[PDB]
Structures are given as C-alpha cells and as structure tokens.
Design a protein around this ligand. Structure first.
Ligand SMILES: Nc1ncnc2c1ncn2[C@@H]1O[C@H](COP(=O)(O)OP(=O)(O)O)[C@@H](O)[C@H]1O
Length: 477
C-alpha cells in the first residue's frame, strides 16, 4: 500500500519537537510492513539545502493563489515530496516563528496551502503515483481531510494523528473567504469553532479515523482535563479514535552494543550491568554501594511531577536508597532538588542541564527510574528503561499507563510484571510506589526476573509501525 504522509516537519530535516521524531521514524519502520510512504513536507530553506538531487515532478498553478513546484527526493531512507512554494516557505526563520520569535500572520495560509496540495495529490493529481490513503499529522496538516471532503472528487481515506492537542490552528473567521472552501464548510460539521476558525477541529471532524500516541492518551483527551476544549468534538467521533504507542530506535538503544555506556550486557547476561552502576555513582560523586539506586531523567516541571519527586527524596534516602537526577526546568524545582543533594550529601546527586551520553549510562546503571508525570502522551524514558533493564516506576498517566506491567500480586504470581505504576498521581501514591520498589529490590529473584522480562519487551518502531499498518489496511477497507 501507498501512503501519503503530511506534516510540517520531519527528522532529520526539520524539527521543533517530538512531532518530527515520529514523522521521521514511522515511514522507515513501515517499510518493514510493506507500506510505502511518501511524506509531503514544506520546502523550507533548510529543507532544500539539506537534500540531494531533487526532482521537479509537478507544479501547482494555484494554491490559495500561489505558484509551487513539487520536488520528489529520497533523503536518507525518506521518500520525500517537497512543496517548493517560495511565497510561503522561503523566509529564513523557524518554520512557524518569525525572525522576531513570533507566529507568521501567514501561518493559516501557509499550512492550508500545504494541506490543499496534499488533498490534490490524494485526488490523483500526480501522474504515476497515487496514495491509497493519507496520514496527516497535527494541526499544520489537519486541513487535508477538510479539503478532500469539500473537493469535487470523492475523498480517499484519511487518518489524522494528534501529537500536540494544545496547538489547534485557531484563527479569526475573517480568513475564511481566503480558504477556497464552500460557505457551509464554516459550521459544526466543518471548521467553525466558537465563531473562530480551527484547523485541528476541522480535521477531527472530517478525517476518517483519528489517532494519538497512546491508548491511554486517547482516553484522556476525551476528558476536559486533557482535551484542551476539543473533548466534545473528539468524543463524538470516539468510535474512530485510536491510540498507538510510539516505538524507539532499538538498534541505537541496545544495551548489548551501546557505545555510550561503560559496559555492555543483555537480558541473557546481566552480570556486567553492575559495572555501569558503579560508573553512575562515580560520575555523580556519590557513595558506591549495593543499595537501591534510583534516577530521574526529565524536564523538571509540574507537568512531569517533579514537584512530587522533590517531596519524595527523603523517602528514598530514609529507605537506604540513593537518587541521581539529570534534567532541567522550573528553577524552584531545580533548587529544591539541589538542596536535597546537600541535605543528603553522598546519597543524592543532582545534575542540571542536558547530557545524552549520561542518559544512556544512567539507564544502564541505575536500578529504577522515577517518572511521576501528570502529562505524558506517550513517553520515551520508560521504553529505554525496559530495554536497558532499569525498572520503571511510573505514574499511570497516558503512555506510562500503557507500557509498564505493574507488579501487583497477580502479575508477580504469573511472573509477568515489568515495573511499578501508581495512581492517583500524588505524593502519597508516589511514596507508596517507591516503598514497593525497594521491597522488590531486596528480593533479587523477583527483581532480576522483572528486568529480564522488561528487557525482552518489543519497544521497537517496527512493532509500533505494524499497528499503524493494520489500521491503514483497515481504513483502506
Ligand atoms: N536532562 C536531560 N539530559 C539528557 N536527556 C534528556 C534530559 N531530559 C530528557 N532527556 C531525553 O530527551 C528526550 C526528550 O525528553 P523531554 O523529557 O525532553 O521529552 P518528553 O516530552 O518526552 O518529556 C527524551 O529522549 C529524554 O529521555
């Protein structure tokens, strides 16, 4: 099957957030499932520069009143379809922000044009290649299903994935007459959102199927706490809402080969793991012993529950454990953390900033990682931890609730548990989770078993991509 992906960004060409990571990894992974994907991305200056040997394969005479060439190029396993619309994308500034740091007043027309071109490509406008379906990503591309719906030619199936529910492509209804859409399209059934225009809302309304980055997150955005005002809409289409967990690069993240850790190991052979634990303590300048070593590797914010992690350090230390923290954020949280490091000198080590190699070493040498998030559409940290044999201790929120098998009586009895989850997401819940982890740690037969199992979890992109394929094939009937 041939799929047309649609996004305003893609790794490694352009990136402002995790959006590009998924859009850049899925297509490659999907090749393993027999799915050819061509990704339509804007001809950003940085895009045309990066790529090699581009081929003009089409020209749109009128794209909301603008000329555009369509270059097709293969870039590092990525089969791309670049949209060269100098009037929209030749700006020299972020893809969305001006040289001044703010949104282009043009944004609405810039991505509407990107969606419209995609809609036409989906309509068979390109001789030689026609998609069986389209997969749009986020608000920049959510208008693709809208233009297909209102186009004369019947729509082909569309899937819209929400990565960023907080960015809804909301604009004044005063741009409506410049969108090349029928008047009735400005309605409930269409793109009107409280007398304003909302692109995301439009696509949520028109797409054949909707998705996001975890089953649990798909449940959450149906509630007011996560829907960002869109829960009413999505809820009316819940019967076509899907949640699919993100994968990771399990070739790069493989403890058996990772070059950014002290010593390599595998589920089959863990002895070597302890050498990484030593190195982690040495690096953080803390005691090096056989006691539980917890880590945190995250942005220090209320969103990530690090407010709860600060009131929970004493509980760790009090239990005989250690804690090492790598991450940056809320200066009040940094401080309270830094302060914990002095009050519990030798037992708690904090490191503020960014450090990817250390991040690989911490996954390889710490015993457990605390991820007390209140918000986590999917999450990567717990997936790396499983892979690496670091037991995740996570809040039951979004992706975290979907990817860890909690060590409850039943799971331990069938030896199916891979980690510790807690809910609700409170300090009490957190201290409880922690205590449990330490109790588990002091039962080595149980602990190592949890590790070996977590380490055999398929957290690869291919696995994730296989779930998209099933859906694709299902949408394509
Ligand atoms: N302080 C840090 N140093 C190094 N890597 C980090 C740090 N904080 C997060 N990471 C890693 O960077 C990526 C982005 O995580 P952030 O935590 O930045 O993203 P998310 O939105 O997933 O929480 C993840 O792969 C995470 O493991």
């Amino acid at each position: 099957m041939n799929v047309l992906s649609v996004s305003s960004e893609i790794y490694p060409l352009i990136k402002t957030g995790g959006l590009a990571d998924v859009v850049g990894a899925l297509p490659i992974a999907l090749e393993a499932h027999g799915v050819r994907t061509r990704t339509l991305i804007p001809g950003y200056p940085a895009v045309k520069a990066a790529v090699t040997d581009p081929v003009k394969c089409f020209e749109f005479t009128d794209l909301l009143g603008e000329k555009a060439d369509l270059l097709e190029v293969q870039h590092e396993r990525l089969d791309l379809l670049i949209l060269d619309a100098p009037a929209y994308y030749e700006r020299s500034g972020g893809p969305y922000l001006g040289q001044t740091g703010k949104d282009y007043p043009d944004n609405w027309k810039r991505f509407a044009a990107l969606s419209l071109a995609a809609a036409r490509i989906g309509a068979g406008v390109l001789p030689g290649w026609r998609p069986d379906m389209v997969h749009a990503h986020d608000w920049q591309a959510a208008m693709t299903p809208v233009y297909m719906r209102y186009a004369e030619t019947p729509e082909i199936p569309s899937l819209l994935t929400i990565h960023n529910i907080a960015f809804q492509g909301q604009f004044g209804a005063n741009i409506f007459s410049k969108l090349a859409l029928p008047a009735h399209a400005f309605g409930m059934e269409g793109i009107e959102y409280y007398n304003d225009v909302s692109f995301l809302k439009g696509g949520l309304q028109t797409a054949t199927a909707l998705s996001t980055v975890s089953p649990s997150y798909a449940e959450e955005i149906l509630t007011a706490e996560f829907g960002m005002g869109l829960e009413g809409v999505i809820g009316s289409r819940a019967h076509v809402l899907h949640g699919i967990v993100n994968g990771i690069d399990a070739d790069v993240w493989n403890p058996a080969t990772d070059h950014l850790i002290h010593d390599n190991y595998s589920a089959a052979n863990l002895k070597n793991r302890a050498l990484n634990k030593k190195a982690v303590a040495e690096h953080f300048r803390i005691d090096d012993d056989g006691s539980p070593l917890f880590c945190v590797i995250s942005r220090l914010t209320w969103q990530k529950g690090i407010d709860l992690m600060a009131e929970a350090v004493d509980e760790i230390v009090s239990l005989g454990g250690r804690l090492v923290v790598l991450g940056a954020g809320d200066v009040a949280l940094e401080g309270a953390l830094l302060a914990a490091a002095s009050r519990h000198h030798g037992r708690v080590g904090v490191a503020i900033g960014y450090n990817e190699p250390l991040s690989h070493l911490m996954q390889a040498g710490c015993d457990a990682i605390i991820i007390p998030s209140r918000f986590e559409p999917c999450g990567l940290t717990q997936l790396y931890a499983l892979r690496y044999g670091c037991i995740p201790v996570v809040a039951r929120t979004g992706g975290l609730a979907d990817t860890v098998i909690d060590a409850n009586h039943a799971a331990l009895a069938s030896k199916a548990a891979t980690g510790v989850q807690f809910s609700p997401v409170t300090l009490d819940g957190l201290k409880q989770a922690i205590r449990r982890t330490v109790r588990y740690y002091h039962d080595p037969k149980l602990w190592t078993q949890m590790q070996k199992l977590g380490m055999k979890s398929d957290v690869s992109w291919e696995k994730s991509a296989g779930l998209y394929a099933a859906l694709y094939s299902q949408l394509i009937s």
